[PDB]
Amino acid sequence: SMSVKKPKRDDSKDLALCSMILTEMETHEDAWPFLLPVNLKLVPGYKKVIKKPMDFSTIREKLSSGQYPNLETFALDVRLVFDNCETFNEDDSDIGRAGHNMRKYFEKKWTDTFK
């Protein structure tokens, strides 16, 4: 509350560390569905169904330009990528499996780096 604060957690490396995680996600072999924004002209249904599209290139640009106020807003956009994928793709599809694999990969790196 006013003039009453928990001890200050060091957040000075968060930017660098989120960039590293994002690099590891970018270079994973199953990243290919997620590297670029879904082409809303060429994929029927996407625009109407997926209210907030997100992809790794968009996260990278937001990251690089100070548009994440903290590491939690960064994790929310990563999770959005996989939540969108589960909304639009069957579990038993190459893309559906890719999204489950990548979410696992991310959540481990996240826990190991920050928890």
Asked if residues 102 and 83 have their Cβ atoms less than 8 Å apart, the reply is no
**Cβ-Cβ contacts under 8 Å for 25 (sequence gap 6 or more):** 31, 34, 56, 78, 102, 105, 106
Burial class (CB within 10 angstroms; exposed 0-12, middle 13-18, buried 19+) of 89: middle
Asked if residues 53 and 34 have their Cβ atoms less than 8 Å apart, the reply is no
Burial class (CB within 10 angstroms; exposed 0-12, middle 13-18, buried 19+) of 80: middle
CA distances 86 to 29, 59, 66, 72, Å, are 19, 18, 28, 21
**Resolution in angstroms for this experimental structure?**
1.8
Cα(73)–Cα(70) distance, integer angstroms: 6
Q: Which long-range contacts (CB under 8 A, 24 or more apart) does 93-101 make?
A: 95/33, 97/30, 98/30, 98/31, 98/32, 98/33, 98/34, 99/33, 99/34, 101/30
Asked if residues 102 and 28 have their Cβ atoms less than 8 Å apart, the reply is yes
Closest of 30, 32, 21 to residue 77, by C-alpha: 21
Angle between helices 14-27 and 94-114 (to 10 degrees): 150
Question: Which spans in the chain are helix H?
Answer: 14-27, 46-49, 56-64, 71-88, 94-114
Cα(113)–Cα(5) distance, integer angstroms: 24
Structural domains for the chain: 1-115 (1.20.920.10)
Cα(110)–Cα(115) distance, integer angstroms: 7
Asked if residues 34 and 81 have their Cβ atoms less than 8 Å apart, the reply is yes
In whole angstroms, what separates CA 70 from the centre of its chain? 14
CA distances 87 to 23, 45, 103, 110, Å, are 25, 11, 14, 23
